[PDB]
């Protein structure tokens, strides 16, 4: 089969700056009818590929300006003339020339911006999940860039550890930030032990830690 | 408006079948070819073979003959791909295109079809309101969200006003538990101001386990 490197595996970029990805295949991929039928896609966190480039350098319906393809042979590149935040993602290179038709293995654009401190919420446990015999507090960590961020539980000021799950969101397509959920898992009779939940946490737009907050009952 | 409207998610023991469908619409179903692509971590995007839509003829990726099958159903504008012999190696999401040009460059997709092969116990989730209080207020915007507590497998989709609120929405990555169980949260920020007369609704789907969730977020 034709193999599709893709080359560099990943990219940072900054607003207004170009980006270079290239796509190099084991083989030559000219079709019976002369063309290259040499594709490059975008794909965003749960949702399918979108076409940018076909045939090697046509521009699909739609897509802006900054985009363009060229190449020839084994070696073809996508450029973005200036990265803008909506461009975040996965970049596929796909060639349609000869059965089976391969993908490439993927670039993962990233784009830089200025530091933004988290906006951070807690949530104490609904009386519907207390009810069950579980307790959930949820820390939320809202629109924050760099992605590096660090959460601390702390029960009447104790520190935590192993009873707590986080996930971070892809970057956001608008404003190029990343938000974080915590939840700290207790049971019904250890959540009623204690007053104090509070979520702490520490980031590069903020000079000290902030605690986050409330009482049982409260 | 072409559409390609793929089955929900599925869940299979291993040695199951499973058939996934893609419906077509918005164009001449017999126009195109309908291919089907695989997504698999590790693996990544791979092209499973394609359908001619007139005589149901059929091209496969060699890789995927003796596991694929590839059919269609003209009077109903649906093709379909079915698993057989699942084993976990076929845990991936897949996806129906056309190339709408006549030729094989991918123009239209389907949404995606994720088919989970376990023989761990499917479990359908626990939806929990996120609600506004003073705690989760930053100068006049207000925080709230769904805890979607406790299910197996993935996924578990959530949108909030039936779609109709989707602006300040953070659906965050399942987390998996020690247990085998996924937990997500979805929050969305909203104006403080009109708590009391805005509905908050998280509208919760987990098709593998049949739930289908419509929760009212109430404020504190």
């Known amino acids: 089969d034709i193999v599709m490197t893709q080359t560099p595996l990943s990219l940072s970029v900054t607003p207004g700056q170009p980006a270079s990805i290239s796509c190099r295949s084991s083989?030559?991929?000219?079709?019976?009818?002369?063309?290259?039928?040499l594709e490059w896609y975008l794909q965003k966190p749960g949702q399918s590929p979108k076409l940018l480039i076909y045939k090697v350098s046509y521009r699909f319906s739609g897509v802006p300006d900054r985009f363009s393809g060229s190449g020839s042979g084994t070696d073809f590149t996508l450029k973005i003339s200036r990265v803008e935040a909506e461009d975040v993602g996965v970049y596929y290179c796909f060639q349609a020339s000869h059965v089976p038709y391969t993908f490439g293995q993927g670039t993962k654009l990233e784009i830089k911006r200025t530091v933004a401190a988290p906006s951070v919420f807690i949530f104490p446990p609904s009386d519907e999940q207390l009810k069950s015999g579980t307790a959930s507090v949820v820390c939320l960590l809202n629109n924050f860039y760099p992605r590096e961020a660090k959460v601390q539980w702390k029960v009447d000021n104790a520190l935590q550890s192993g009873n707590s799950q986080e996930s971070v969101t892809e970057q956001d397509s608008k404003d190029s930030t990343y938000s974080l959920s915590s939840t700290l898992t207790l049971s019904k009779a250890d959540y009623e032990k204690h007053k104090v939940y509070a979520c702490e946490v520490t980031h590069q737009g903020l000079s000290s830690p902030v605690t986050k907050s409330f009482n049982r009952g409260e | 408006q072409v559409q390609l409207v793929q089955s929900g998610a599925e869940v299979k023991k291993p040695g199951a079948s499973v058939k996934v469908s893609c419906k077509a619409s918005?164009?001449?179903?017999?126009?195109?070819?309908m291919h089907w692509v695989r997504q698999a971590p590790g693996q990544g995007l791979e092209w499973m073979g394609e359908?001619?839509?007139?005589?149901?003829?059929?091209t496969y990726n060699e890789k995927f003959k003796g596991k694929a099958t590839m059919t269609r159903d003209t009077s109903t504008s649906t093709a379909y791909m079915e698993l057989s012999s699942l084993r976990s190696e076929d845990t991936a999401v897949y996806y129906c295109?056309?190339?709408?040009?006549?030729?094989?460059?991918?123009?239209?997709w389907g949404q995606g079809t994720l088919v989970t092969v376990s023989s761990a116990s499917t479990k359908g989730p626990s939806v929990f309101p996120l609600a506004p209080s003073s705690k989760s207020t930053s100068g006049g915007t207000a925080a709230l969200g769904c805890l979607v507590k406790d299910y197996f497998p993935e996924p578990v989709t959530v949108s909030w006003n039936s779609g109709a609120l989707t602006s300040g929405v953070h659906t965050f990555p399942a987390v998996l538990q020690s247990s085998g169980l996924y937990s997500l949260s979805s929050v969305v920020t909203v104006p403080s101001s009109s708590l009391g007369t805005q509905t908050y609704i998280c509208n919760v789907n987990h098709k593998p386990s049949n739930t289908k969730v419509d929760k009212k977020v109430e404020p504190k």
């Open positions: 359908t001619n839509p007139r005589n149901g003829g059929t």
């Open positions: 918005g164009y001449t179903f017999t126009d195109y070819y």
């Open positions: 083989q030559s991929i000219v079709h019976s009818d002369g063309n290259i039928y």
């Open positions: 295109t056309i190339g709408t040009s006549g030729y094989d460059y991918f123009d239209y």
